[PDB]
Structure 1
Amino acid sequence: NYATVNDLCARYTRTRLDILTRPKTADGQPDDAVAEQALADASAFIDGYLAARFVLPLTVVPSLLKRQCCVVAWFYLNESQPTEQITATYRDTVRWLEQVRDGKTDPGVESRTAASPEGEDLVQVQSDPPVFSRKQKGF
């Protein structure tokens, strides 16, 4: 996963996450298993769009992917009743993901060192060896 439960607790208060996990667990103690499942689903959703251009798993993880995963996971958790701002943020995130998939914007590089994730050849052509070219220099 691109984000951990601690990263989710960094963006959102532990009290809110506990309230979210209160009904989903069987006992009175809040459980983070549902949070991990939401994170895994968010990572799969991001990978669905990322597979168009870059080979999976990613060699280097861009920094913004963590925030995108946290946003979509929080939207997934707030399924019983979503607020206007949460839905707007999720829509903006999915629009950005579609833009990345279409190639209209670059995902970016990790801040620690300039490095973009590896990807397969989007464009490839084939032809027989070029005889009679100007590089021959034999005539």
Structure 2
Amino acid sequence: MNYATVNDLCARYTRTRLDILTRPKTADGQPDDAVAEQALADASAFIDGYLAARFVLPLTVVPSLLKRQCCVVAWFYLNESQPTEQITATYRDTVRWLEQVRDGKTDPG
């Protein structure tokens, strides 16, 4: 329940690059921050599948580590029209990390 915001995404990737991703998904060709917010919500739902093995949800508080790891997944989601090896690799790293949190090998902060 969301672990990052559109502003967080902008801080990590820039609004320049976010807008480039959301522009082509619309009919009118303008940026659409609601598309990024949906990715962030979807990434948070995905993360909660792993967290729920060990933690009662919703959490208090969100470590800045989960914030980063929500932005990584959301960014992967937002690039699914033109994926890159680098973005895909960051995502797979974060999935492995989530599995480690689920399994008790590491902590979310």
Q: Same fold (TM over 0.5)?
A: yes
Distance 1:64 1:39 in 2: 15
What is the aligned residue count? 108
More helix by share: 2
* CA-CA distance at 1:30 after TM superposition: 1.3
Tell me by how many angstroms 1:69 deviates. Answer: 0.1
Q: Deviations over 1:31-90 (max 9, x none)?
A: 111000000000000001000000000022222000000000000000012111111110
Q: How far apart are residue 14 of structure 1 and its match?
A: 1.4
Q: Aligned to 1:29, what secondary structure does the other structure show?
A: coil
In structure 2, the residue matched to 1:3 is 4
Percent identity between the aligned chains?
A: 100
Instruction: Please give the alpha-carbon distance, in whole angstroms, between the structure 1 residues aligned to 2:40 and 2:61.
Output: 19
Highest Rg: 1 or 2?
A: 1
The 1:84/1:28 distance shift into structure 2, 3 A limit, reads: closer
C-alpha distance in 2 between matches for 1:35 and 1:54: 26
Unmatched tracts of structure 1, length 5 or more: 109-139
Unaligned runs of 5+ in 2: none
| Whole-angstrom distance in 1 between the partners of 2:83 and 2:71 | 15
The one-character-per-residue Cα deviations of 1:88-132 (angstroms, maximum 9, x if unpaired) are 110100000001101111222xxxxxxxxxxxxxxxxxxxxxxxx
1:81 has 2:82 as partner? yes
